[PDB]
Coordinates of C-alpha atoms and ligand atoms in Angstrom, one line a residue:
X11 CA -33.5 -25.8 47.6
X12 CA -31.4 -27.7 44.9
X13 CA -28.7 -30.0 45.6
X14 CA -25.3 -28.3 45.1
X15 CA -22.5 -29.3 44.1
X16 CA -18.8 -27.8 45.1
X17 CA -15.9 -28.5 42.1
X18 CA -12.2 -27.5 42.4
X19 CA -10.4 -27.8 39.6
X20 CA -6.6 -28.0 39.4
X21 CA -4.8 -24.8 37.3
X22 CA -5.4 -24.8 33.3
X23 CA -8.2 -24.0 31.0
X24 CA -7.8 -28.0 30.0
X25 CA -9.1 -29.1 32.9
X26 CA -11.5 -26.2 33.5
X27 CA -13.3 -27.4 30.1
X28 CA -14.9 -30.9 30.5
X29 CA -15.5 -29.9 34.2
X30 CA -17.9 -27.1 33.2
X31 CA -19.5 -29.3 30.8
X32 CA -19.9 -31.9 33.8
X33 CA -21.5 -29.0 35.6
X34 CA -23.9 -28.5 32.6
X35 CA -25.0 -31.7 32.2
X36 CA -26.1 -32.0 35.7
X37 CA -28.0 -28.6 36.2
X38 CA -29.2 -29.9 32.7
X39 CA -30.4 -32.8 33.2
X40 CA -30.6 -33.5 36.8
X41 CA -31.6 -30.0 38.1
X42 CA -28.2 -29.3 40.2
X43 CA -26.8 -26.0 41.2
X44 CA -22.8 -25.5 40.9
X45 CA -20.3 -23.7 42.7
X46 CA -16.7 -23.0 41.1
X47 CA -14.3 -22.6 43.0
X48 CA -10.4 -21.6 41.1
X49 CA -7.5 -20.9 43.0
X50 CA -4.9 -18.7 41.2
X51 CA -1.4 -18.2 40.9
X52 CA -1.6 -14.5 39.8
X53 CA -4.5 -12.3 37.7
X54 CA -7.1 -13.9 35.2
X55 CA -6.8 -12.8 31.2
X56 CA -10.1 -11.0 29.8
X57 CA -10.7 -14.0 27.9
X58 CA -10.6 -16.1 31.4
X59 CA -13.3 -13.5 32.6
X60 CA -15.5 -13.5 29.9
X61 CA -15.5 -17.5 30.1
X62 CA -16.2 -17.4 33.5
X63 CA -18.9 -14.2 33.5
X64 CA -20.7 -16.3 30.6
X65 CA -21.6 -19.7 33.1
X66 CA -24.8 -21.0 32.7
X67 CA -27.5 -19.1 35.3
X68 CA -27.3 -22.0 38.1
X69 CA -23.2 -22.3 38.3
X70 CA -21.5 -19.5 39.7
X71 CA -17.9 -19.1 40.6
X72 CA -15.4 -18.1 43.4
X73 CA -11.7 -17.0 43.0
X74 CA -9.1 -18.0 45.5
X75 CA -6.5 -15.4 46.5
X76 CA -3.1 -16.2 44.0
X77 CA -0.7 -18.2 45.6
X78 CA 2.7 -17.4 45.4
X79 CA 5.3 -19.4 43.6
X80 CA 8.6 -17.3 44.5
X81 CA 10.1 -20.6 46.0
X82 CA 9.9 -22.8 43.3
X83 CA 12.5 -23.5 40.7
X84 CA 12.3 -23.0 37.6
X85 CA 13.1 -26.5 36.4
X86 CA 9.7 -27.4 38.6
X87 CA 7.1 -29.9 36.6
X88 CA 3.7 -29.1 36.3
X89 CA 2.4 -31.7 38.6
X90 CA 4.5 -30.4 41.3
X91 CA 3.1 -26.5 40.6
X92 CA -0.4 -28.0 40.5
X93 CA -0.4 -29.9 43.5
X94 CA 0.8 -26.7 46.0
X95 CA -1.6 -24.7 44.7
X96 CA -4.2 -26.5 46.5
X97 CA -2.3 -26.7 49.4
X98 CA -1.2 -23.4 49.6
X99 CA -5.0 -22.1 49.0
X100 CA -6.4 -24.9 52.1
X101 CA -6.9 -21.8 54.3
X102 CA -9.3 -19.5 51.7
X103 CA -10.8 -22.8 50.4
X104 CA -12.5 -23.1 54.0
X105 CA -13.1 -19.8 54.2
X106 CA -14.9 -19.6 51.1
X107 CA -16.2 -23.6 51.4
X108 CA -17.6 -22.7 54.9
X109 CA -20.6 -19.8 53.8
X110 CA -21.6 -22.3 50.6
X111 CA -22.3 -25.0 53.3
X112 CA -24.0 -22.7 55.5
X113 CA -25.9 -21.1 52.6
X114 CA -26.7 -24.3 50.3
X115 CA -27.5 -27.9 50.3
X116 CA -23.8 -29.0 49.5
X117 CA -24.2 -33.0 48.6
X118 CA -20.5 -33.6 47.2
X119 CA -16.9 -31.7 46.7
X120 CA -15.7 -32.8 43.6
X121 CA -12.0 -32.1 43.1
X122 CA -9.5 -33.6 40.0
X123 CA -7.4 -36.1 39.5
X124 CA -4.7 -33.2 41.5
X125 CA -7.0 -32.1 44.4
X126 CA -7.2 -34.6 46.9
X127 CA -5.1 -32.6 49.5
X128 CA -8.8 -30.6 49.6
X129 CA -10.4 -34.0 50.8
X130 CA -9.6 -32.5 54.8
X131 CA -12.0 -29.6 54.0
X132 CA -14.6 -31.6 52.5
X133 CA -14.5 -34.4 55.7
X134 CA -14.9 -31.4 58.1
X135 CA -17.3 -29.9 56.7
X136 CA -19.3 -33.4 56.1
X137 CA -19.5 -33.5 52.5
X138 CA -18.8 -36.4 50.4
X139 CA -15.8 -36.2 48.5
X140 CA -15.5 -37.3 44.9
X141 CA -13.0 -37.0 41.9
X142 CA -13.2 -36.4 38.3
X143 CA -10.3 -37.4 36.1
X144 CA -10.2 -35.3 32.8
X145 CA -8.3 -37.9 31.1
X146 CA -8.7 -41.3 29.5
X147 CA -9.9 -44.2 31.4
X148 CA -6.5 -46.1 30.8
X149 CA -4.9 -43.0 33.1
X150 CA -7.2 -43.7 35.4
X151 CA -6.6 -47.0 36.1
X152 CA -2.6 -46.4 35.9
X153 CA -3.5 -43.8 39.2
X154 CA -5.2 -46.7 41.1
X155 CA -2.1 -49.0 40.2
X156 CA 0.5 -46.7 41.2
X157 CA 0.6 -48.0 44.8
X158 CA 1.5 -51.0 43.7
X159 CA 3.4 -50.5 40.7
X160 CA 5.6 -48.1 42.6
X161 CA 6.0 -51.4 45.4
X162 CA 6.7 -53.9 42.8
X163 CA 9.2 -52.4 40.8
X164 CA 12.2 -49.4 42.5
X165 CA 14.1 -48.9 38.7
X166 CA 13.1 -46.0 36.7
X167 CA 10.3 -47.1 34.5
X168 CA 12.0 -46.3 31.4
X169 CA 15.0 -48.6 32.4
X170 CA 12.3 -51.9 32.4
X171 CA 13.1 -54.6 29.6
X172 CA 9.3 -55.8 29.5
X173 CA 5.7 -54.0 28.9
X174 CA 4.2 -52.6 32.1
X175 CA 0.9 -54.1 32.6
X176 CA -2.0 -51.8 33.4
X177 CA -4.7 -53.7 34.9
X178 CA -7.4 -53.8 31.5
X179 CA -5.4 -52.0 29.5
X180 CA -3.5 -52.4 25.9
X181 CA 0.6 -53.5 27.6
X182 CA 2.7 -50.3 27.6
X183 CA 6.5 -49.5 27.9
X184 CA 7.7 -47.5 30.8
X185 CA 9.0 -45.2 28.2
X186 CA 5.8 -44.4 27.2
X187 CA 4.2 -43.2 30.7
X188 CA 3.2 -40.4 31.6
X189 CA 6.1 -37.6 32.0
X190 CA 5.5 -36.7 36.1
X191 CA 6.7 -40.8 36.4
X192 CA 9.8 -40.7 33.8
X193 CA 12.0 -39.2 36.6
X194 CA 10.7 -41.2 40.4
X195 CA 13.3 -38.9 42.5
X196 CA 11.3 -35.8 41.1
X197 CA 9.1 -34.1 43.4
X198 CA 6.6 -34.4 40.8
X199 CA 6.4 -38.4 41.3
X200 CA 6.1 -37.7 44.9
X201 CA 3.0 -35.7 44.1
X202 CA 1.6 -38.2 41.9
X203 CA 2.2 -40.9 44.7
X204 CA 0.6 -38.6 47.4
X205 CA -2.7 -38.5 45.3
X206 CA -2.7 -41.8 44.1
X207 CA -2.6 -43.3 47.4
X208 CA -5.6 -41.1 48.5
X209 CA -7.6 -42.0 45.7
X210 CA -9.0 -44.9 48.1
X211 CA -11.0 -41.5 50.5
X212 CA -12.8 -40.5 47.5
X213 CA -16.3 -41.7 47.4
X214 CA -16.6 -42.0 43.8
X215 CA -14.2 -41.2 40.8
X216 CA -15.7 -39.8 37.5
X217 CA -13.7 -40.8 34.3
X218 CA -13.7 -38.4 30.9
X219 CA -14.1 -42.0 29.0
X220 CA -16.9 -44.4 27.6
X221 CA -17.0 -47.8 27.0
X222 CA -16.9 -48.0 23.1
X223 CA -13.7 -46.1 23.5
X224 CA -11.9 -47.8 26.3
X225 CA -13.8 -51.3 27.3
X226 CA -10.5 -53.0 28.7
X227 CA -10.2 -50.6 31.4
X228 CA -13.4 -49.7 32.2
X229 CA -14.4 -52.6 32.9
X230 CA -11.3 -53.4 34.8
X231 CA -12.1 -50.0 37.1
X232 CA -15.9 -51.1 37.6
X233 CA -14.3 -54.4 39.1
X234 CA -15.3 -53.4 43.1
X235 CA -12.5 -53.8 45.6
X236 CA -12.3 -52.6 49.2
X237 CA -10.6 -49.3 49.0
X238 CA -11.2 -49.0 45.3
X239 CA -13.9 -46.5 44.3
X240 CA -17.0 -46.4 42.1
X241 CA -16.1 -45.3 39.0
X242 CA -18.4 -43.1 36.7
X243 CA -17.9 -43.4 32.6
X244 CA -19.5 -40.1 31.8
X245 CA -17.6 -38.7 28.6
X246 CA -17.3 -37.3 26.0
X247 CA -17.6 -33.9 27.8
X248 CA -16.1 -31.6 25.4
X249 CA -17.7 -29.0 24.9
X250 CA -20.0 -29.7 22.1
X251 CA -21.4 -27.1 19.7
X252 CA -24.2 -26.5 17.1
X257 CA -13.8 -15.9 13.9
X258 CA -11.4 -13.3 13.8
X259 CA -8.9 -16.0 12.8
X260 CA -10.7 -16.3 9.3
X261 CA -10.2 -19.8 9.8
X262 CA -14.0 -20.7 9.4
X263 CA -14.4 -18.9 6.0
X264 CA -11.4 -20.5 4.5
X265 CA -12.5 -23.8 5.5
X266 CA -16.0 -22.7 3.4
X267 CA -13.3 -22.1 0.5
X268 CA -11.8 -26.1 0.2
X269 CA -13.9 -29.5 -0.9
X270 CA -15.0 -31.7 2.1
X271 CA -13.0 -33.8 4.2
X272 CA -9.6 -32.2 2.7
X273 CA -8.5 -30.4 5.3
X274 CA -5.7 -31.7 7.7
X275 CA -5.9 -29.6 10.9
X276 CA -2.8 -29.3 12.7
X277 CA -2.5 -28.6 16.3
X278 CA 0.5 -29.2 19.0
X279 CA -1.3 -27.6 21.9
X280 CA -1.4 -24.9 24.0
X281 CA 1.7 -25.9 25.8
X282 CA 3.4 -28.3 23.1
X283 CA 6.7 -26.6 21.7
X284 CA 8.9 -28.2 19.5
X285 CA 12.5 -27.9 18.4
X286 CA 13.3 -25.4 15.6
X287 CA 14.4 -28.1 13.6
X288 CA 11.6 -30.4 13.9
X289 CA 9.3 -27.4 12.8
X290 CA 11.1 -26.8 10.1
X291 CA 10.6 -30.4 9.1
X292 CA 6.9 -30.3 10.1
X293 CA 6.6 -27.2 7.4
X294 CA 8.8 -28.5 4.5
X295 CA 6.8 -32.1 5.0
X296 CA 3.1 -30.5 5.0
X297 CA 4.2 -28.7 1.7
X298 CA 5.9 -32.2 0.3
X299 CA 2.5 -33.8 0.8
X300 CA 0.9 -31.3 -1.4
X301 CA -2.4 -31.8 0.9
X302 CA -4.3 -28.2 2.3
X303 CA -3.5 -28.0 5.8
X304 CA -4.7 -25.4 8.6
X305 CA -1.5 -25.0 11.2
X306 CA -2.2 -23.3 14.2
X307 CA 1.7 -22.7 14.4
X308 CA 3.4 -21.4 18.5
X309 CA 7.3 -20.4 18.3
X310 CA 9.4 -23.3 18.8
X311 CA 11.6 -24.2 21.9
X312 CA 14.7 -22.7 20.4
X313 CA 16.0 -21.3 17.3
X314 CA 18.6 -23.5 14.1
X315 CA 21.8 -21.8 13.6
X316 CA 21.2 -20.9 10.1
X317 CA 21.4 -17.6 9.0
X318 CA 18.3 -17.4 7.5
X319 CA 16.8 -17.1 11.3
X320 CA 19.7 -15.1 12.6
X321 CA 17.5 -12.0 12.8
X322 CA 14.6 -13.7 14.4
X323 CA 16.2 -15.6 16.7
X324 CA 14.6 -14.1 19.7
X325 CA 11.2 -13.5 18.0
X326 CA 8.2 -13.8 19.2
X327 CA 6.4 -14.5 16.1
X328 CA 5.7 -17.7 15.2
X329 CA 5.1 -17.0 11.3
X330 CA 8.8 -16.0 11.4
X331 CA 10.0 -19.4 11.8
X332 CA 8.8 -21.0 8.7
X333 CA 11.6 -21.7 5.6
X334 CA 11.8 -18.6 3.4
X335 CA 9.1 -18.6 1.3
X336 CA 6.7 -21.2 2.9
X337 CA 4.0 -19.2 3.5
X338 CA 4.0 -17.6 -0.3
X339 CA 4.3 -21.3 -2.0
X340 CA 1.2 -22.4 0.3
X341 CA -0.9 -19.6 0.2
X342 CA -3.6 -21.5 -2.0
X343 CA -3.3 -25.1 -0.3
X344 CA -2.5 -23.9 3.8
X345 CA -3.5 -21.8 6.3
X346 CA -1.4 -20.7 9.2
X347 CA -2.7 -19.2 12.3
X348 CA -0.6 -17.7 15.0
X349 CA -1.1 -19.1 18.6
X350 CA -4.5 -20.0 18.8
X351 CA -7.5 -21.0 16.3
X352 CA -11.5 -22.1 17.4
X353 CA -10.5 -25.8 17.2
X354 CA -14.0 -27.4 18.1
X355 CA -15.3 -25.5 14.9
X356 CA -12.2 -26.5 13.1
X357 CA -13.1 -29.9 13.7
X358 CA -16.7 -29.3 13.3
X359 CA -16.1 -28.1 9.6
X360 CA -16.8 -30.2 7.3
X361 CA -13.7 -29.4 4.9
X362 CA -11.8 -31.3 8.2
X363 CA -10.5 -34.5 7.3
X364 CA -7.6 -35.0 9.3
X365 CA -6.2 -33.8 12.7
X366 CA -2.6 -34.0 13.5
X367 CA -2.8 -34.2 17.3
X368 CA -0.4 -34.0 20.3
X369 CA -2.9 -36.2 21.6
X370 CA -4.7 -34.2 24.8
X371 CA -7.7 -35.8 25.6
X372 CA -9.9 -33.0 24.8
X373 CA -8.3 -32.4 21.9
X374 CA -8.4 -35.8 21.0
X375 CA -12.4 -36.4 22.3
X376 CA -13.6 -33.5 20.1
X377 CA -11.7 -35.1 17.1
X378 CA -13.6 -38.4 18.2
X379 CA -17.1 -36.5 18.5
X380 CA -16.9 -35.2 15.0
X381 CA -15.3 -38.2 13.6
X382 CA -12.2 -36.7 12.2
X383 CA -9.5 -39.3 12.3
X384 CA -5.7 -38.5 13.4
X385 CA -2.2 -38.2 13.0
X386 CA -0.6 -39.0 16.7
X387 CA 2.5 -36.6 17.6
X388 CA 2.6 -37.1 21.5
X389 CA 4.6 -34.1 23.3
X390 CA 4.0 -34.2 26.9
X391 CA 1.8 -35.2 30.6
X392 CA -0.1 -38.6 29.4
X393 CA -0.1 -37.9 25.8
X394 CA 2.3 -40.7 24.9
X395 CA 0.2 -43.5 26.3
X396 CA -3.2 -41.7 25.0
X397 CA -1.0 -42.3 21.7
X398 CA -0.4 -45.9 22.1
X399 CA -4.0 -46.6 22.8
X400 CA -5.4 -44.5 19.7
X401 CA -2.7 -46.3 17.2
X402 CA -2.5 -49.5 18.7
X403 CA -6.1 -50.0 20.3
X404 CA -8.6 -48.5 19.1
X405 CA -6.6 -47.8 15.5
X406 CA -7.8 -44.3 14.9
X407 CA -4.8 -42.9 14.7
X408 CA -1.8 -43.3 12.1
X409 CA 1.8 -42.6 13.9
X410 CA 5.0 -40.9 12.4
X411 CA 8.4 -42.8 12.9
X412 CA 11.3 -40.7 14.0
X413 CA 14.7 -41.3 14.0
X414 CA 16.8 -42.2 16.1
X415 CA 17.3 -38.6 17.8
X416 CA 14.1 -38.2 17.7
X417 CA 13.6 -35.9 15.0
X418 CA 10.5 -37.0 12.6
X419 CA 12.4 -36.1 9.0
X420 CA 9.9 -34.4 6.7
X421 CA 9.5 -37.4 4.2
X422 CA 8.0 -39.7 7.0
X423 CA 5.3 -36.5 8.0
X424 CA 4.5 -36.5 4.3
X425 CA 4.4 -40.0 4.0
X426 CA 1.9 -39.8 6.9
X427 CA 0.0 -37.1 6.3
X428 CA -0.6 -38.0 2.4
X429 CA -1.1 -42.0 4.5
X430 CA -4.0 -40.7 6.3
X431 CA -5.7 -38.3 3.7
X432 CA -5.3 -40.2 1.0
X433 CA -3.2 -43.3 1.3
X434 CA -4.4 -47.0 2.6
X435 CA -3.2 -46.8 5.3
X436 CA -5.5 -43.7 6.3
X437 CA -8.9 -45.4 5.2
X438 CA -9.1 -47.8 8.5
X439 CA -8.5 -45.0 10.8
X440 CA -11.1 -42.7 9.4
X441 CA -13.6 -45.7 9.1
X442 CA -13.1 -46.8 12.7
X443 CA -13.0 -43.3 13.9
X444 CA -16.7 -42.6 11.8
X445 CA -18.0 -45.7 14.4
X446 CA -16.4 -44.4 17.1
X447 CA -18.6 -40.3 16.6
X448 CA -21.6 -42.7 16.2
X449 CA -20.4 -44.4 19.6
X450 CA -20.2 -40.9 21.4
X451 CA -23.6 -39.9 20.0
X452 CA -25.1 -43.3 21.4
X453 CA -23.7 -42.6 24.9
X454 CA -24.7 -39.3 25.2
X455 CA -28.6 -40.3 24.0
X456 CA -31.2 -40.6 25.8
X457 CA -30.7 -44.0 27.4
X458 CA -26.6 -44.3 26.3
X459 CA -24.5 -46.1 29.0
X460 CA -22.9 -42.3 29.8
X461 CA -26.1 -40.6 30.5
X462 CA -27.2 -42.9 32.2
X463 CA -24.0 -43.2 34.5
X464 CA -24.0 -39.5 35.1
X465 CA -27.8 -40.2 36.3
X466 CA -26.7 -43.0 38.7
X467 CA -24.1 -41.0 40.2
X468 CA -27.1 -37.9 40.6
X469 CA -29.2 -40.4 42.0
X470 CA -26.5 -41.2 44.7
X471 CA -26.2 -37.7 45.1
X472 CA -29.3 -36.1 45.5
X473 CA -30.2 -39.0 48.2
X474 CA -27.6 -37.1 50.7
X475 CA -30.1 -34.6 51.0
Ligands
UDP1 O1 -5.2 -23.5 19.3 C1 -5.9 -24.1 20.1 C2 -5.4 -25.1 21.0 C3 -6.2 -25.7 21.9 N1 -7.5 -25.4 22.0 C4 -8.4 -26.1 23.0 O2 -7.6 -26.4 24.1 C5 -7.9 -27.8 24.6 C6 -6.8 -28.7 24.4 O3 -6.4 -29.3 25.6 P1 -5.9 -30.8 25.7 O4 -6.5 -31.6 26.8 O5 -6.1 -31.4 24.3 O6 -4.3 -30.8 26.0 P2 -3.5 -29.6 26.7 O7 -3.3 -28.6 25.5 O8 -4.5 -29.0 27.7 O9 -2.2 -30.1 27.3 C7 -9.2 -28.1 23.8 O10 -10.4 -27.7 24.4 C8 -9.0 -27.4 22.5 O11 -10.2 -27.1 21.8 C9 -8.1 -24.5 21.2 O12 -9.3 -24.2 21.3 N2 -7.2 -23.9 20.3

């Protein structure tokens, strides 16, 4: 029968995406069967069905019973929401993990960057344990570090005068890490502790990442160690292609490469204010844009919103009159657009990002270079590295509350369409889609590390 593999991936679609592709590939390319299993906090959306009832023919799928969350605050971080429900589902994990092992040839649990509380079920049921980290290869390596970051240094990492050294990676302030390390007395930083530290059980780690992207720390993480383990450079896994929203069709409408998609998202809100700013700048620039526009985190105390203050409507947000002075250059969509065909399109010549790595690794496999507006979880150092590294990106300057004033985001957006400024970035970013089609190829360094790690694999059995 085929080797199988067992994944677990940690709550959200943005995990949930390169992790099917990862499936893919394998039962692609190395004749693997799959097994998803998805522990839940409450009922799927039709959409989640359909995504799920629409699996390639050799991956199927189990649903954990929904955990319950009653105890938690409201105040709790993500991390910290993430990690319990894997603890809280242990019980139905080896329930369900117990008839795949009896039924198939299970060679490996593969859990995320959140899951290594499952290891115990995967070591009692013999089966190697692995992880796959969705994001980039400088997170990665921060994970492995933590151990000893968090032994080095007690102050909050904001609070430290000089760049925090990742080992192979571009220096970074402690301002700039990740959000579930900004506050150490959080339970979130506990979480990310407990995890880190049992990094060292996992018999190999596969990283979202490839070499032309992030060198430094790959080849930092491929530097053996005892307790250190093999890491895989597989990426880009995005989901990679060949509308209700209209979106698609309007694009057909504008001249190539004039487009400057605009995306905070799924969970990245901003502040009235800074939205309004975000609006009045894109129509200062007098460049098209395509907004996939969410409500903000609260509402300005101007009367002009005092009737939709508690709407739900995102549209209703914009200055008076936005959406009629644009109607020829911009497109705003409500809530949620087909992105990866957005930045497929050839009319697409600009993305203004919040910086997720799949976001940003679909902008990087169709070349479309980037405005950087970092929100939330690592997004601030995937930031750093994309202006400041690898150069792709051009970077807004706030002031000093913050607030990015619209001038600067027309300033930037006309920078990277037009200006100077923007013709590195889209140059560099052209070499780096080449990159990603090289090692993907046929003999690219990521195929053929996704075929060392199914060697390893498939030998179990
Ligand atoms: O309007 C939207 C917003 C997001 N996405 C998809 O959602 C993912 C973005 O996740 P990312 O890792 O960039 O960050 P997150 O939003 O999960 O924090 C990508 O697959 C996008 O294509 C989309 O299709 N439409």
């Amino acid at each position: 029968e085929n080797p199988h593999i067992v994944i677990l991936p940690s709550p959200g679609m943005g995990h949930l995406i390169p992790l099917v592709e990862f499936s893919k590939r394998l039962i692609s390319q190395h004749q693997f069967s799959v097994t998803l299993i998805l522990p839940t906090d409450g009922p799927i959306s039709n959409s989640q069905k359909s995504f799920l009832n629409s699996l390639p023919s050799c991956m199927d799928y189990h649903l954990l019973p929904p955990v319950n969350f009653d105890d938690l605050p409201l105040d709790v971080k993500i991390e910290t929401r993430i990690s319990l429900t894997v603890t809280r589902s242990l019980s139905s994990l080896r329930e369900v993990f117990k008839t795949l092992v009896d039924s198939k040839k299970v060679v490996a649990f593969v859990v995320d960057l959140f899951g290594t509380d499952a290891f115990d079920v995967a070591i009692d049921f013999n089966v190697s344990p692995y992880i796959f980290f969705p994001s980039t290869a400088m997170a990665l390596s921060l994970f492995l570090y933590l151990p000893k970051l968090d032994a080095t240094v007690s102050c909050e990492y904001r609070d430290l005068p000089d760049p925090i050294q990742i080992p192979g990676c571009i220096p970074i302030h402690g301002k700039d890490l990740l959000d579930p390390v900004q506050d150490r007395k959080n339970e979130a930083y506990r979480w990310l502790l407990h995890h880190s530290k049992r990094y060292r059980m996992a018999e190999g780690v596969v990283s979202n990442s490839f070499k032309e992207l992030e060198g430094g720390p790959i080849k930092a993480l491929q530097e053996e160690e005892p307790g250190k383990p093999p890491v895989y450079p597989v990426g880009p896994l995005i989901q990679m292609d060949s509308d209700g929203s209209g979106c698609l069709t309007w694009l057909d409408e504008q001249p190539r490469g004039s487009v400057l998609y605009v995306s905070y998202g799924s969970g990245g809100t901003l502040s009235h204010e800074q939205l309004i700013e975000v609006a009045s700048g894109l129509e200062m620039s007098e460049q098209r844009f395509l907004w996939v526009i969410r409500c903000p985190n609260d509402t300005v105390a101007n009367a002009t919103y005092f009737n939709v203050q508690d709407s739900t409507n995102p549209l209703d947000f914009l200055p008076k009159g936005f959406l009629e002075r644009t109607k020829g250059l911009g497109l705003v969509v409500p809530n949620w657009a087909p992105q990866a065909q957005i930045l497929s399109h050839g009319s697409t010549g600009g993305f203004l990002t919040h910086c997720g790595w799949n976001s940003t690794l679909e902008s990087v496999v169709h070349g479309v270079p980037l405005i950087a507006w970092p929100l939330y979880a690592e997004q601030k150092m995937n930031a750093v590295m994309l202006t400041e590294d690898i150069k792709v990106a051009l970077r807004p300057k706030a002031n000093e509350n913050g607030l990015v004033g619209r001038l600067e985001i027309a300033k930037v957006v006309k920078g990277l369409m037009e200006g100077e400024e923007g013709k590195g970035v889209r140059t560099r970013m052209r070499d780096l889609k080449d990159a990603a089609a090289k090692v993907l190829s046929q003999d690219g360094s990521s195929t053929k590390a996704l075929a060392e790690l199914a060697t390893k694999l498939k030998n179990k059995v």
